[PDB]
Design a binder for this molecule. Sequence first.
Ligand SMILES: OC[C@H]1O[C@@H](O[C@H]2[C@H](O)[C@@H](O)[C@H](O[C@H]3[C@H](O)[C@@H](F)[C@H](O)O[C@@H]3CO)O[C@@H]2CO)[C@H](O)[C@@H](O)[C@@H]1O
Length: 222
Amino acid sequence: DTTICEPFGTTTIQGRYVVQNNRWGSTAPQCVTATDTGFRVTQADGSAPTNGAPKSYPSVFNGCHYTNCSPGTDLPVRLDTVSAAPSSISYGFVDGAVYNASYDIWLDPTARTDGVNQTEIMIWFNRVGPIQPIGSPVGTASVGGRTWEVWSGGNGSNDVLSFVAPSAISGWSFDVMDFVRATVARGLAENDWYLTSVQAGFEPWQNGAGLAVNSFSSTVET
Ligand SMILES: OC[C@H]1O[C@@H](O[C@H]2[C@H](O)[C@@H](O)[C@H](O[C@H]3[C@H](O)[C@@H](F)[C@H](O)O[C@@H]3CO)O[C@@H]2CO)[C@H](O)[C@@H](O)[C@@H]1O
């Protein structure tokens, strides 16, 4: 195991994914302990007001995020070359606290490895406490055999399309391309954009210690 407490500390697991503390919204300590297949949040101090940015997005990813590219990743890859993008996750939830468990999937018109990607897909596997996505609800969508409440808006940097589960999902395997297709169909990307990373983790606003990604996988096949 490897403990990371630096706000933007990272480590690689299984020689394939990056675990990031990614403490981008908080002045209080946070630590994650990386395992060979995921990570656990071992300290997550402080609170963030629940109508604003979360404290952080501790997560594991395949791809490139602010110059940090996971070992051997084939991302960025143009979407029209992707046959499938399977991913799977197992989450450990905490009772109480205020957080989501979410995927972040980033798309851009360029083969982007640094900076803000133009579109963000956020898939909320769980929601606890009085938090909601960026923007406005739109309606429901059926993606991957599951129903989602779709939200759309912008954060000032990028577009955000969110798919929110009706109740907690502790584990799933799915095709990221199913969500990319739904995003393209709403005009928030095009078939000749690039997939630049597939990330999974948590956005905590209050507490968060004990949250875990037990396992994660992501492949992008061309
Ligand atoms: O990780 C190093 C870089 O962190 C940058 O902060 C990013 C952060 O990495 C992203 O994960 C985060 O994404 C937000 C997104 O903007 C929201 F729309 C969404 O609801 O939630 C995700 C996850 O919380 O965005 C922040 C801030 O832009 C930081 O700015 C860089 O300087 C740093 O190099």
